[PDB]
Design a protein around this nucleic acid. Structure first.
Ligand code: DGT
Ligand code: CA
Ligand code: CA
Length: 326
DNA sequence: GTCGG
DNA sequence: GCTGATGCGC
DNA sequence: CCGACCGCGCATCAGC
């Protein structure tokens, strides 16, 4: 991290814009700049050097110059002092509490961990579980635990039906030595883009993982997406493992390559890749890549036989998962 | 906040 | 109930 | 200058 100081600064600014200003495009602008700088292989010496990078403009160059000279940003020092901004930024750290909800809470006088803990009845289900595991959810997961988690999930899914394929994606598939949480892509031959020849495909798998006490809470659950909480088994006399967030996504078997591209990320990589797709006259989602027509209407799904084919369509050289960590 | 048409 | 918008999250 | 900014699942709420 040659430029940690700068990218931390921009990340803080992005978070401010999302959580407090509720300015989602300013948030993405800061994130995009943060990401381009993070992969820049030189220690940056000026805002002018930075402004050469795409996504870094005048305003960010000016901030980078201030940060380099002093080591601080006045705009940020002030944000850190504002109690309302600080409270909103804190509350949004709870899963299920976003910028709108946080601001509502701050109005009602709820703005600390203690406040939340005595007002659970003011929280929806998701929020209540986010509060319950507030501390655990901020811890990262060593790849070594991610591997044990993978073994449990893969083996339990095999027991429900040997035809399931479960692939762990997210940062784990990108080779990270630690992950924020577990993301599992699931497929079954009974569920394709053409037919759903079997109901409860996701349910049954969630049920089995609850049965062995791996999954411990549900945040949300539909026919194709589960978001919840899980925990590794611990040994005799040892402290329990932290509770972890787990997402499970059931994707049509014939659309696996688009799905695994999506779920492997990173998020910024996906946003960048999809944006580029639009520039090349395609739209990409987790299911398909489709041509855009003159009218601007998504056409029919193009044939895809590998992750690489998606890269081919938009004239990108293939990038292995480990190089998609933007 | 940045950028391409 | 459904539909569409909005909030939140991936 | 200025329109456009990735794309979508689930939970919630208003309006009908
Ligand atoms: N298109 C798109 N895909 C996203 C977005 N956010 C997340 N994804 C996809 C790509 C991510 O790698 C994948 C899993 O999301 P996560 O929040 O778990 O992130 P990731 O595993 O990369 O990082 P982590 O180590 O868990 O903090 O979901 C998004 O905003 N847009
Ligand atoms: Ca993850
Ligand atoms: Ca996740």
């Amino acid at each position: 991290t040659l430029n940690g100081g700068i990218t931390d600064m921009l990340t803080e600014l992005a978070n401010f814009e999302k959580n407090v200003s509720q300015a989602i495009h300013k948030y993405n602008a800061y994130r995009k700049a943060a990401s381009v700088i993070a992969k820049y292989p030189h220690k940056i010496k000026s805002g002018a050097e930075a402004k050469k990078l795409p996504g870094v403009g005048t305003k960010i160059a000016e901030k980078i110059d201030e940060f380099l000279a002093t080591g601080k940003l006045r705009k940020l020092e002030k944000i850190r002092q504002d109690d309302t901004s600080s409270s909103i930024n804190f509350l949004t750290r709870v899963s299920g509490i976003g910028p709108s909800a946080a601001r509502k809470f701050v109005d009602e006088g709820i703005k600390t961990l203690e406040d939340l803990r005595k007002n659970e009845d003011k929280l929806n289900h998701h929020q209540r579980i986010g509060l319950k595991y507030f501390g655990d959810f901020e811890k990262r997961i060593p790849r070594e635990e991610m591997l044990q988690m993978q073994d449990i999930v893969l083996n339990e899914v095999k027991k429900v039906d040997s035809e399931y394929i479960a692939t762990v994606c997210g940062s784990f598939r990108r080779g990270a030595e630690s992950s924020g949480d577990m993301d599992v892509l699931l497929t079954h031959p009974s569920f394709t883009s053409e037919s759903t020849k079997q109901p409860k495909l996701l349910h049954q798998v969630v049920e089995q993982l609850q049965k062995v006490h791996f999954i411990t809470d549900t945040l949300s659950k539909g026919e194709t997406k589960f978001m919840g909480v899980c925990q590794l088994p611990s040994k005799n006399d040892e402290k329990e493992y932290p509770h972890r967030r787990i997402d499970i996504r059931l994707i049509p078997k014939d659309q696996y390559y688009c799905g695994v591209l999506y779920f492997t990320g990173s998020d910024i990589f996906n946003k960048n890749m999809r944006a580029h797709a639009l520039e090349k006259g395609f739209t990409i989602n987790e299911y398909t890549i489709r041509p855009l027509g003159v009218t601007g209407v998504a056409g029919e799904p193009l044939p895809v036989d590998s992750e690489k084919d998606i890269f081919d369509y938009i004239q990108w050289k293939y990038r292995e998962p480990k190089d998609r960590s933007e």
